Amino acid sequence: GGYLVDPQTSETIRGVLRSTASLRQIASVVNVEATSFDVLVDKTDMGS
């Protein structure tokens, strides 16, 4: 009879939950296909 009984598996393979906070929520993302991205800053300012 031991062969006649079969355990029932779960419905979905479940995994360990890991946090999704990624700094992508506060940083600025851009949609840029180009092999890179450039930004242009003013490390100093003019004078008056």
Place this chain on the structure above:
Amino acid sequence: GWASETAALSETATPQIDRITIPLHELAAMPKASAFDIETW
């Protein structure tokens, strides 16, 4: 003042005025210019 019943009552005081001048200077900047629209920016 508080005047008396029988007194002079002459020429109490008057504020001395003062005029403060605001020279209205100017603040000048001259950068040279050599997508960016740096002109408007």
